[PDB]
Amino acid sequence: MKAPVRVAVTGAAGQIGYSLLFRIAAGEMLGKDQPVILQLLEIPQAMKALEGVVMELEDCAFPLLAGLEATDDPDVAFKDADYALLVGAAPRKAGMERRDLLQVNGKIFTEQGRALAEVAKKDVKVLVVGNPANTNALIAYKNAPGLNPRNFTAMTRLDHNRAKAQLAKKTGTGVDRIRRMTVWGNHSSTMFPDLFHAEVDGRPALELVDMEWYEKVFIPTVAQRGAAIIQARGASSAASAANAAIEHIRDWALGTPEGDWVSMAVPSQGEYGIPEGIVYSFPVTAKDGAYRVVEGLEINEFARKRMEITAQELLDEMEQVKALGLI
Amino acid sequence: MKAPVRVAVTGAAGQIGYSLLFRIAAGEMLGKDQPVILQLLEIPQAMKALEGVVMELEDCAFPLLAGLEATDDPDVAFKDADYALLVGAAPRKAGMERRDLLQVNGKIFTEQGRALAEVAKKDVKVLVVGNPANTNALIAYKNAPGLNPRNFTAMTRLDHNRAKAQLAKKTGTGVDRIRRMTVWGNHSSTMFPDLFHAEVDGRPALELVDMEWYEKVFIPTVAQRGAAIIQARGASSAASAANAAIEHIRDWALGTPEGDWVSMAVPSQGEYGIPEGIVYSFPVTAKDGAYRVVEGLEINEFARKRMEITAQELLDEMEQVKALGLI
Ligand SMILES: NC(=O)c1ccc[n+]([C@@H]2O[C@H](COP(=O)([O-])OP(=O)(O)OC[C@H]3O[C@@H](n4cnc5c(N)ncnc54)[C@H](O)[C@@H]3O)[C@@H](O)[C@H]2O)c1
Ligand SMILES: NC(=O)c1ccc[n+]([C@@H]2O[C@H](COP(=O)([O-])OP(=O)(O)OC[C@H]3O[C@@H](n4cnc5c(N)ncnc54)[C@H](O)[C@@H]3O)[C@@H](O)[C@H]2O)c1
Structure with a gap:
């Protein structure tokens, strides 16, 4: 049909x-x-x-x-x-x-x-x-x-999936039971994978893992993952990137699961106070080809600091291209 | 599940x-x-x-x-x-x-x-x-x-899918309308792609194509197809060989479509007069884990000669292996 x-x-x-x-x-x-x-x-x-x-x-x-x-x-x-x-x-x-x-x-x-x-x-x-x-x-x-x-x-969906894979391993639970993961910001070393709102089989992530782990282990491990793959295989992670690309389009076109959201980098309209215009990764839901940023989440000092570092990186990059007269 | x-x-x-x-x-x-x-x-x-x-x-x-x-x-x-x-x-x-x-x-x-x-x-x-x-x-x-x-x-399913592809191309019909392709024999240059029993959108293949095209163009082109891909990409046909492996397992474990068949190389039990023992590609149907050779097709002279040639090649290789004390 x-x-x-x-x-x-x-x-x-x-x-x-x-x-x-x-x-x-x-x-x-x-x-x-x-x-x-x-x-x-x-x-x-x-x-x-x-x-x-x-x-x-x-x-x-x-x-x-x-x-x-x-x-x-x-x-x-x-x-x-x-x-x-x-x-x-x-x-x-x-x-x-x-x-x-x-x-x-x-x-x-x-x-x-x-x-x-x-x-x-x-x-x-x-x-x-x-x-x-x-x-x-x-x-x-x-x-x-x-x-x-x-x-x-x-695309920030590969970072989002890596984050879910590491949380799953750490808590010994199936990756299909991780929900509400968010990666905020740039696709770069300043990205912020956020466990404050994630859930592991119904339970808040931070009831299962501690902040030290989070900050000293999980963050740097998700950030270094692409390099770990290159060190091991001698080539960049193409298959897992292609998989993240398929997922980003599929969940945008067919919709996100009830109760869940995915990460997408989209042009900011000031959500969370992020400067307008830059392409910044937010938690988003989608239905029938349209997505909406998830607003109303509570942002603590730890997250805010990180969210701003990454926004600033993007603002400097945009400053660069403008200066080059590209936009 | x-x-x-x-x-x-x-x-x-x-x-x-x-x-x-x-x-x-x-x-x-x-x-x-x-x-x-x-x-x-x-x-x-x-x-x-x-x-x-x-x-x-x-x-x-x-x-x-x-x-x-x-x-x-x-x-x-x-x-x-x-x-x-x-x-x-x-x-x-x-x-x-x-x-x-x-x-x-x-x-x-x-x-x-x-x-x-x-x-x-x-x-x-x-x-x-x-x-x-x-x-x-x-x-x-x-x-x-x-x-x-x-x-x-x-696996001879890559040769089988290549043959389906060339026929769809020649006849200008979609690949999904091609049924009853058969690739007999060895996965080698003596493979024999059989248009005798195939159907294109309901019609026998040979009403749409001529014997001359079949023998002068179609056979050599399916046989050289792995070489064309290497000459073009500089690397062999991994993705399409991986697809044919998936399809080979899938159709055997799940089942072939009604009124259709697939190519698989299995240990000969004398079907069509093919020597026992050698792993020879035949037309087969499959249901829920088990397959059966499609028997009782009419084999004309043009087909038998080719079936024979690839059969001999395999017989000879087996000879070698036995001589080496491998079986
Ligand atoms: N956002 C992410 O998570 C993520 C992850 C991994 C890689 N990537 C990026 O994916 C991009 C491509 O990666 P790759 O591994 O396939 O590289 P690759 O070098 O294997 O392939 C890149 C392809 O880009 C093609 N290309 C270049 N300019 C083009 C143009 N103007 N029009 C059309 N095609 C053109 C090249 O010819 C080449 O085929 C890189 O920028 C890489 O850093 C992004
Ligand atoms: N039947 C067909 O249709 C068909 C089609 C394409 C390729 N092939 C065959 O596919 C085979 C593999 O192809 P490729 O493109 O992936 O080559 P490749 O070299 O990229 O990969 C082959 C892998 O096999 C591994 N390997 C070697 N000996 C092994 C062993 N004892 N146990 C486990 N792993 C072992 C190698 O380390 C390598 O990782 C080749 O023999 C090729 O001729 C057959």
């Missing part, structure tokens, strides 16, 4: 995309009753590898894959998109300093913002994965004249 | 394993109500990386992942196993020659065949993916005294 939706994914020949695309086509992201047309974007040099990804997608004979198209032009890839996962971002190069990274990313995200605004559906749902996620999402929405800024979000 | 099954996977830190494990844990192979316990095996030098893969699986927060254990000991990995996916095989090493390759695999598959017989469930279902899969499955079942040899299979 359902007509196909079109899903645009950039950086599609890269490792996150190689773990992402196959599960999207299998129906994991939007439902096993919803056929998808994948519109994939790569830079010109990676187009040959993209063709080989396309042949592997064909070789899975996915009944929900209603169409497949690969391109290096953003205006083709975003054409009529329902959803856009913006994974591709500037690579690190030698002696390429910070501002140099900002500039290159600024150009990609400006151009992509523009294209979305010109050819996508006006209600396109956008997720930015490529680093620095939050600031890239800011440059994209700011350059996307005529689209709702709230349809541009950045 | 059902009670958890134990799934053992070898070569778990390799490429096919990195694409396989997350979809298994997600519920794609045995259903969304069946929790799984993953028992992962690697050689000792890849244990560090396997720990990094373990961490990414934790970080997915999967609700059906009821346990996860990594080991370098087969008797640990296979313990109480309900399913065993034998992905890891002898790597190619320089100057290493055929029979050399044969010996190194011979060592792997005997010790594995042995661990499974000592410690897995008696009804353990075994899928061999590592090359040469058909002959590897022969070594393992021959060395797994006590287990039903028919619970030992090899």
Whole structure:
């Protein structure tokens, strides 16, 4: 019964995309009753590898894959998109300093913002994965004249899932019984995973673990997790990032569980006193494609301090891009 | 929910394993109500990386992942196993020659065949993916005294799905309308993809395509497809091989669709006059854990000759293995 939706994914020949695309086509992201047309974007040099990804997608004979198209032009890839996962971002190069990274990313995200605004559906749902996620999402929405800024979000869901995984291990309880986890702020080393409102099988988290653990063990362990993976495997965590991307879109489109909320970085409207405009991770619920920040939670001194440190980081980054005349 | 099954996977830190494990844990192979316990095996030098893969699986927060254990000991990995996916095989090493390759695999598959017989469930279902899969499955079942040899299979489902894909492409019809594809024989260049019994949206395949296209274009192109992917991406077809492994287990454990069949390489019991013993791909249907070869199809001359050629190849390989004292 359902007509196909079109899903645009950039950086599609890269490792996150190689773990992402196959599960999207299998129906994991939007439902096993919803056929998808994948519109994939790569830079010109990676187009040959993209063709080989396309042949592997064909070789899975996915009944929900209603169409497949690969391109290096953003205006083709975003054409009529329902959803856009913006994974591709500037690579690190030698002696390429910070501002140099900002500039290159600024150009990609400006151009992509523009294209979305010109050819996508006006209600396109956008997720930015490529680093620095939050600031890239800011440059994209700011350059996307005529689209709702709230349809541009950045991914903190991998940090959120890591946090739940560590709390589960510590309390010896199944990860499916952890609820109300929140990661606030930037996707960076200043992010704040908040246990003050989390529950472990009905019980408040902080009745099961102590503050010392929290501050000296859990926080630095969630923060260092991506580096732990690279040390062990020799490669970054693509499969678990792809899984977090699928979850962020799926829970936004299909809704969050009753009684629960997820973390999403979205353009702040001043919730919790956070400065307007920056893309900041809040606790959110979603229903039928729209989300709402969870307000009213009580914020103690420990959380406030942390929430502000991370907001300030984002404000400085935004200061940088502005100075570069990017927004 | 059902009670958890134990799934053992070898070569778990390799490429096919990195694409396989997350979809298994997600519920794609045995259903969304069946929790799984993953028992992962690697050689000792890849244990560090396997720990990094373990961490990414934790970080997915999967609700059906009821346990996860990594080991370098087969008797640990296979313990109480309900399913065993034998992905890891002898790597190619320089100057290493055929029979050399044969010996190194011979060592792997005997010790594995042995661990499974000592410690897995008696009804353990075994899928061999590592090359040469058909002959590897022969070594393992021959060395797994006590287990039903028919619970030992090899994967030809990737060839089967590639064939479905090319036919859908040629006829311009969706892949979901293609039924009754069969890939007979070895997972090698002598595989025989059979269009004689296939149906495209209800019509026999050969009313839509001609014999010349079939023999000049379709057969060689399905056989070369693994090479095309390597030449395009620079790496082999891990994600689509991981999908075909999931489908192979899924359709055997859950069941094939009505009026349809799948390809699986199983120990020959003389079906179609195929020599006994060798692990040969046939058309099969399956219901709730057991399969049956589809018998009584009409085999014309064009098909028999090809069935024969790939049958001979396998007979010869088995000869080699026996000569090496492996079975
Ligand atoms: N937010 C998060 O949690 C999180 C987690 C991990 C990684 N990431 C980010 O994901 C991004 C991609 O990661 P990866 O591991 O796949 O890298 P990768 O290098 O394997 O792939 C990145 C891909 O980006 C493509 N790309 C670059 N510019 C592009 C453009 N203008 N149009 C389309 N495609 C383009 C490249 O060609 C490459 O295929 C990185 O920025 C990384 O830091 C974010
Ligand atoms: N049947 C088919 O359709 C099909 C398709 C694709 C690939 N293959 C086979 O897949 C196999 C693995 O492919 P890959 O791309 O993942 O290679 P890879 O090298 O990336 O991974 C293989 C993994 O197996 C591990 N390994 C080696 N010996 C082992 C043992 N004794 N026990 C446990 N692990 C062991 C390695 O350490 C490595 O981690 C190859 O033999 C390839 O020929 C078969």
